[PDB]
């Protein structure tokens, strides 16, 4: 009967909670007393990419740590030479409602999508001289919330239908479809090893999906409200999440539970995006309250503030070289900081 | 600089094209076509002559409407309604064949912090079957609180008051309209509300507000 297997579900959940507690012999918040802070961060806008005219929603660095892609409500996906501020390309989007950017690891491809359910992929290096649509990855039922390239041929998508997917860009079919959120998925992050990727949904449950075997290897449920940001720690074993709970938390895939809560009493503002510095010491999260904060992941204190926006700091990325963080905003000016 | 002067030149051409596209996109007026399922959202745009958003657009005497139907795709509304902040008006519509989930939807939209200062046009659609409904059944079944007669005018005014009373802020206006699928009148009222709205926003830009 349904009651019997529901009782078994309750027993299993209790047992795994008990084992998860059994793994909680300590927590980083109490170990970190042995180490000093990085001191105050006071990064300032070394550039401003003032080309956009309506609410940059997402941005993503290229692998060379100098080019960008930025998707905005304007309907333009204009990609930057960060050093000279040049608009090296400006792709006219199919839809202005794009919530997602992806800049391929080779730099050849860019993909973008949003409320249109489609992860459109743009080929930059055409012999014809202009950026053009490589693939319309249609097949999700909800809106898209994040995209990340594993390689130039296969991309992973997170969507509002409570499913992620991994595609074959050469044929446009999902080589794996990932399901098992109860809410809807807001963010996504490939591991550095490209073997496993985490996602977070509005049901406050974040989980790691292995890309080959689509099984969720661990479900994380520490949050009180919707997960809104996802990013892996640079070592590929830990990940951090931001939520409309006005707080972030750090999770570990081998301890399968939460370690830190990134909350201060005065920040009643939701989290729009997260990312890490190259060393993982610094966790950078963009808040609704017109600013980003940068916080020692090992200590959870606000190491500094990168205010300077007229609206929500809607997106955020850090260079692979670790020498710059971009903070897109609904002000449409992409600050570049160092 | 080296020949990268040519890179800066092409950057300038791209930036000028972005500005020329911006000052050609802001001419169009943005409308969000919220509403409950089968309320008549498609009908109004069809008389104007799909798994995700659909953004149908049209012109009406020197004004171009971008008229987004965000309701075709289902997910937590708090995650995609907030995109349409800075839309000029919500074209909220209601069907009376029901239903309180529509009342609840209005109580959400008209109170929403992203639409606090955003006007709303409320089309009470398919009045014809609303008259048939009250003619064949008492309105009390839909509103147990109702004490008025089942005559059309009183019931319609009652439900209209029910909807517009959910407004929590005085600054906005709710241009409720009983369209009854009248051809081209719904478009006219949309235009008139939008003309009021853009006079308001022009006047508010000038520092008169």
């Amino acid at each position: 009967e349904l009651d019997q297997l529901r009782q078994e579900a309750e027993q299993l959940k209790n047992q795994i909670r008990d084992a998860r507690k059994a793994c909680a012999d300590a927590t980083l918040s109490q170990i970190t007393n042995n180490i000093d802070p990085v001191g105050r961060i006071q990064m300032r806008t070394r550039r401003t990419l003032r080309g956009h005219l309506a609410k940059i929603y997402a941005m993503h660095w290229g692998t060379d740590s100098r080019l960008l892609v930025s998707a905005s409500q304007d309907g333009k996906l204009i990609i930057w030479d960060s050093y000279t501020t040049n608009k090296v390309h400006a792709i006219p989007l199919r839809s202005s409602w794009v919530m997602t950017c992806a800049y391929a690891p080779s730099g050849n491809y860019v993909a973008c999508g949003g409320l249109d359910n489609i992860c459109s992929i743009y080929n930059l290096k055409t012999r014809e001289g202009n950026v053009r649509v490589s693939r319309e990855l249609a097949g999700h039922t909800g809106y898209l919330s994040c995209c990340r390239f594993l390689d130039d041929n296969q991309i992973v998508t997170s969507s509002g239908d409570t499913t992620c997917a991994l595609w074959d860009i050469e044929t446009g079919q999902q080589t794996t479809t990932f399901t098992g959120h109860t809410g809807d998925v807001m963010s996504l992050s490939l591991a550095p090893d490209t073997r496993l990727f985490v996602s977070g949904a509005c049901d406050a449950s974040a989980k790691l999906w292995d890309v080959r075997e689509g099984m969720c290897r661990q479900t994380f449920t520490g949050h009180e409200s919707d997960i809104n940001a996802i990013c892996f720690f640079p070592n590929g074993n830990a990940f951090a999440t931001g939520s409309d709970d006005a707080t972030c938390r750090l999770f570990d895939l081998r301890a399968d539970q939460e370690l830190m809560t990134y909350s201060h009493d005065n920040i009643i503002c939701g989290i729009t995006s997260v990312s890490f510095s190259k060393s993982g010491r610094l966790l950078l999260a963009g808040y609704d309250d017109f600013n980003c904060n940068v916080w020692d992941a090992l200590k959870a204190d606000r190491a500094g503030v990168l205010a300077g926006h007229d609206n929500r700091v809607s997106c955020l990325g850090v260079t692979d070289d670790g020498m710059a963080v971009a903070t897109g905003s609904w002000d449409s000016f992409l600050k570049i900081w160092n | 600089s080296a020949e990268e002067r040519a890179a800066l030149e092409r950057s300038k051409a791209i930036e000028k094209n972005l500005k020329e596209d911006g000052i050609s996109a802001a001419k169009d007026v943005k409308l969000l076509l919220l509403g409950a399922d089968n309320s008549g959202k498609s009908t109004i745009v069809k008389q104007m002559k799909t798994t995700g958003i659909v953004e149908t657009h049209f012109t009406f005497k020197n004004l171009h409407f971008r008229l987004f139907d965000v309701g075709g795709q289902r997910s937590e509304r708090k995650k995609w309604i907030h995109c349409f902040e800075d839309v000029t008006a919500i074209i909220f519509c209601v069907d009376l064949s029901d239903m309180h989930e529509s009342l609840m939807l209005f109580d959400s939209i008209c109170n929403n912090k992203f639409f606090i200062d955003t006007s709303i046009i409320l089309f009470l659609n398919k009045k014809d079957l609303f008259g048939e409904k009250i003619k064949k059944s008492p309105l009390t079944i839909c509103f147990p609180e109702y004490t008025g007669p089942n005559t059309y005018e009183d019931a319609a005014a009652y439900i209209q008051a029910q909807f517009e009373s959910k407004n929590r802020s005085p600054n906005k206006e709710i241009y409720c309209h009983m369209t009854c699928a009248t051809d081209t009148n719904n478009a006219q009222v949309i235009f008139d509300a939008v003309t009021d709205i853009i006079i308001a926003n022009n006047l508010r830009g000038c520092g008169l507000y």
Partner: single-chain antibody
Amino acid sequence: DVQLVESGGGLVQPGGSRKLSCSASGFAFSSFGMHWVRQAPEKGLEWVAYISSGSGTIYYADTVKGRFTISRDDPKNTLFLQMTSLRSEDTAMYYCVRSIYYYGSSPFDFWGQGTTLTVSSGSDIVMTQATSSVPVTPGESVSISCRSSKSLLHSNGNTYLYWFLQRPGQSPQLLIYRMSNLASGVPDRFSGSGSGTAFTLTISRLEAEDVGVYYCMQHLEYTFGAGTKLEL
């Protein structure tokens, strides 16, 4: 299928004028600069003209300034060279070329077919090559060199040199741009390197298809070297 094709050659009386035309297809013309580079019938390449993207900027060769004028009409995907008061030095095969300038782009990535302009009898960056010919054998490795009057390494870190290969009766081709970067189609057999003013290109496992003249070029300031002819 990119096409750079030119027409308007033939005989012209000295002191006259002739308009060479470049009629491109297969790519977004508007995005590109164009140069109407020319080659003497038995000698090296020479720069002539430069029409920028959207016709926003233009330069000419000192040996043709004022005499030769270039014009671009983007809606027809065409570039023009109007030459006036022709001298004997203007006799040459004229190659239309292609370029795009932005981070990581490859200028001169395509070259035209060539038009034979002929007339009867009537503070600069020079490039030089230590060899005019080298005998080579298939499967061996050939190491070309050229040297230019000034260091091409700009402040921004780029060394603005390009390497071209010309086979008999064939349009010239780009191999390497900015001295390290392979063109989108040049086989990985070829590879460039250099520093200061000394500049080289290496081709390992030379096939017969690699025989020809290896003209190098500068691009720091708006010319071609003399080129070495590999012998089969």
